[PDB]
Design a protein that fits this description.
Chain lengths: 585, 585, 49, 134
Amino acid sequence: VGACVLCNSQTSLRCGACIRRPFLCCKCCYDHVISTSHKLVLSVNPYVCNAPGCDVTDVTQLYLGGMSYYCKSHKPPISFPLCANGQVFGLYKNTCVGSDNVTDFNAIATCDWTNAGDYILANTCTERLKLFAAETLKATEETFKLSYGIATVREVLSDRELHLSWEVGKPRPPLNRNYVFTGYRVTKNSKVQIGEYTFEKGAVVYRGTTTYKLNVGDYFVLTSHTVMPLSAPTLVPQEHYVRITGLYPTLNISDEFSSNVANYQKVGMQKYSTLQGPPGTGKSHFAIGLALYYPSARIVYTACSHAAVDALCEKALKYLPIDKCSRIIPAVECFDKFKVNSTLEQYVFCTVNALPETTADIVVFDEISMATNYDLSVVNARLRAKHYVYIGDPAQLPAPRTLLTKGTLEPEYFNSVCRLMKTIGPDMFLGTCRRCPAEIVDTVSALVYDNKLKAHKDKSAQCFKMFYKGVITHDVSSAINRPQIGVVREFLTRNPAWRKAVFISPYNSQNAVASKILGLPTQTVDSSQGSEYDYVIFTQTTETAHSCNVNRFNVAITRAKVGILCIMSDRDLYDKLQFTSLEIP
Amino acid sequence: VGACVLCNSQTSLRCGACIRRPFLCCKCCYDHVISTSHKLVLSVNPYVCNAPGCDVTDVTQLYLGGMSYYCKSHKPPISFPLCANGQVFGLYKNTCVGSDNVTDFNAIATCDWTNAGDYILANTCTERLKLFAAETLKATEETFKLSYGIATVREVLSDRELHLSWEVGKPRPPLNRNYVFTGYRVTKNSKVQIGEYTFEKGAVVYRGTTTYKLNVGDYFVLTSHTVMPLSAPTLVPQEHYVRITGLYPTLNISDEFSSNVANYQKVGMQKYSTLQGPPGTGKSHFAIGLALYYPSARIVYTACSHAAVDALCEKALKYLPIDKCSRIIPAVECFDKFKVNSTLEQYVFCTVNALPETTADIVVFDEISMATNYDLSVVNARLRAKHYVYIGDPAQLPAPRTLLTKGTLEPEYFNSVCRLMKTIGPDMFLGTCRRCPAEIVDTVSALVYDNKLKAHKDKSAQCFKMFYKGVITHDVSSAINRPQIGVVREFLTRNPAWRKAVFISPYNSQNAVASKILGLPTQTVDSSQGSEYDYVIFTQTTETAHSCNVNRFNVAITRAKVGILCIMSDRDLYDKLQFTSLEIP
Amino acid sequence: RDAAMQRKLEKMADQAMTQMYKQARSEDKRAKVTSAMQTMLFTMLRKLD
Amino acid sequence: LKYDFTEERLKLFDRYFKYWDQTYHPNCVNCLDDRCILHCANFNVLFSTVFPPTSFGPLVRKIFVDGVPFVVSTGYHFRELGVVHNQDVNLHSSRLSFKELLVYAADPAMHAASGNLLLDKRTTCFSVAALTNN
Ligand SMILES: [Zn+2]
Ligand SMILES: [Zn+2]
Ligand SMILES: [Zn+2]
Ligand SMILES: [Zn+2]
Ligand SMILES: [Zn+2]
Ligand SMILES: [Zn+2]
Ligand SMILES: [Zn+2]
């Protein structure tokens, strides 16, 4: 019993056939039911004909006889049609405003999350409806994930390789770590405690976290959790102050933080401030700066994954005093150089999914791109931070949407903070790219960076591009470009110093074949962030929007800090790329 | 309260005057009551006039008088005809769809199970229809057997011979092994614990299982049981998969099951497979070879009788590891080489009457011809397997249908499994007739076997017929041929090497006359399956539909593996059989 | 009397239907408790003999 | 196992109350009316404090039903009324009705006879058994 989403007037009708069953304002509820397929409503008691052996769930046919709700052929002579006056009977009917236009909510609730237009509707709408849309999409994808078949292993071939069967009548999820499985060990009583695994083609290859011995009969599932109703907004109201609020300015400065402090007063000058963080510009070092720029500030290190907070933890063991740090991990192996489960600490390092409800002097949100509107507002629910920092970039990798099928969702429409970053602009900017040379920074700057990123040291002339055609062959969850696999070895033979470079791949199963041919390590484009290598190579494989659209390639090209190899099979970015083109062997 | 047989809608009306009282829905039961003589229906309460001293039982003559059902002369001033609006009173009146065609169920319900047309209806009607038909048939048969007289032993002659007096007012059952008696030892308190018996003319000769000493006052009856309602259909839905599901293929082969494995691939790949097994082609080996094919997979060895299950147990001792076998017998002497009452066993051997409700990988249902649709569906009721195998043949012996008076039941309509393998055909076949010589195989191949069962070794020329006439003077339940009894001994007089041939007879009482004159053992045509002998002699006796059915005789001719003697009074089949006819003394 | 008495026959039929529904549910509950009690007896006797 | 104590009570009555000229029935099931039941329960109260308290209570018996042995109460042994025997007991029963199931699921015999022993030192009341493990 709460207030309805659109009207915020108190009500007690809950949309039954709707996904998350939102609180429905009475006449507003009538609008929702008449304009959608959601014909079921539940009050403190449900609105279903209580006469035994009935089926009807649509509210309109339900009439009120005495203390119960009745369809037409079930009533006593005395009735009171609930579906009357265009206003379904419900609590607080007169303290009701309704909504003139509900069709936006109607399409949000009737949404299967198929096209990019669904995310456009979710992002373009206001606070409450965007939160509802985020919760519905999360619950709906979580529902489909368990709708796929079970990953049973019936034979044990060798180490890191298994023979797996699948449930009949339900499909098979993809062959990458994009959806990590979670099997439990089946005994005579029940199934318990195997762990989280990733399966890829090998015969299959399982990539477990810890050491394990998997026998026959052990089957793995895509475990689901219960998405809970979010409360706080994604962004707290903006307010520009007149002085440094709540913090005492630093006495002495560090030259490595000279470019940091210049942008730091405006961080504490206002409630929340946005960032323009290019890859390898010291954003983690930027986040560390606030601790040295304010020793008494209680800052909290947050990101989408523990491996991303690990980057903040990576720069914490050096500059941050270990006596004041705490890493929070729920009861997966990661950094634990700090003390665990310590809420009452100065430096707090945790993932957005596990930090308890506290208050923060100033928050640092690492990697805001992959954190959607769900976890955008999750942090504000846990902490009413006195200051807010958004470390990340809309021009950086978002979370992979398993439900988005047609249309490519715009970089600005990832969430609220990334949306304003393309309209009012970012409040900060770090103008030095601490890894990439002139050959990479200059090219990526002219792509989506508004030519705002400038070269650091030199043009190493070690980044090369190639023109080619190729013929693609695809499988269940991959696609391998054979001519590029022929080319990659052909290119590396005539210079033995090129064998120290790692191979990057959009579809990691393509490199799995390449790893058999050459043996160079593997990289996933979607998760290549945080990790960088001096020598690294790439094959474009496909020119589709999945792989080589302008922004999802920007992470892979920026992996190298001296020189990179990538054979453009496309021509959309090959013309724009300011690399060196050589002869095709 | 359940779902009605025709419409599957939940109902509370059971046809009281009907044999088994099936569930019937409102309009459905109304159609049954207005289209049959069944004018008693039982709801949660019986539909009779509850006023004292009343006998009205018809549904249409009773009206709702207060909290009871009253007739025209018993009603209060207020009243309501429960037989109104073309729908009898009963629960879920609104949720009742009725049946467009109800004449089939009316015919099956008012059926007296007298002629062949009743069995045609039973086979041609749908799943629940034929299940109810089988239940009604068994119930009627078991009630009819008890309707016969009591077999009172009043004086004791000698061993294996008695004098039997019978109850007055009801007839006497036949004198063969088709109907099994069960006597009880009468004491001052009650009667109990004599055993199962079979009687034949002597003076009467009694056939007991265990050692016993019968005295005066002990009587025997055709004891019946309580037939439980059935749940599962006769056969599971067909599903042809892609590969052998859930089964691990064999490593190395055995030569005698080489041809058996070729038919095992599809069986392990498809749900259920009907078997066209002519007598003694290796069908028992075929079920055994599956265990050799799949040792890990558990197999259920089930037939209509333990003597037929013995054939599976006959080959289990030599081929199957006994430590993994089990024979299930309830609290009759049979094979007990295994451990009794061991449910969780790798190999389970049992009969349709005692198999517990479990699950298994593949079933072997030996002798599918003998069992009806009753026991056909009972196996799916006990055990739902991943694969199914049905050992037997429609070209074999059906059950002895005692109420079948007019017409002979066709091979197809014996049960559900017997129907489809002359419409879609069998899925595997064994052409290796391991016993019968070239004389018998080619004869029975061109009869019902489509010239598909081929000769094994040679034309032994040891099988003979004789173009004879025969003379029959009959008795209550048999017939004897004096000329043919005089022919066989005369034919044996001067060719004494034929004196090791077991005499066969369709009427087993006829050979009892021969066994007195000659002494050679007896063969029951209806029970000659499973047993076989090198030398066997046979008199055709009668050309009526009881004896010279082309397929009911087909088991007797296949008994011999080297040679047979048959004296043919019949001509319909003698013109076809390619044996040697010799002179008539 | 062609649209008034018939408006009491409906109420009588409905109340009879509800009463027999309730009686059927009572019988079903009886069946479940019978099964539960018999199985509890048969499972607790096996520990003592 | 000895539970009768019918001769001992008469011996005690003959030793201490020899000249109490009113019939004393050791078991009250032989009494003529209510007042005699009072007059004999009064004496049984005194004479039952000498015999051990582990012999009082139900007098169970192993009964075969559907080929299975049960343990069901077939009588009682009070301190104030002597021995009372059941009149309608049917060993070798075939099947149990609902009344039989009720009267067999409420008797403590089947419950206690299949539970672990219990020695409770918190109380002075005579403990019997434990149905559970904790
Ligand atoms: Zn809704
Ligand atoms: Zn509203
Ligand atoms: Zn209703
Ligand atoms: Zn009927
Ligand atoms: Zn029906
Ligand atoms: Zn009457
Ligand atoms: Zn007395």
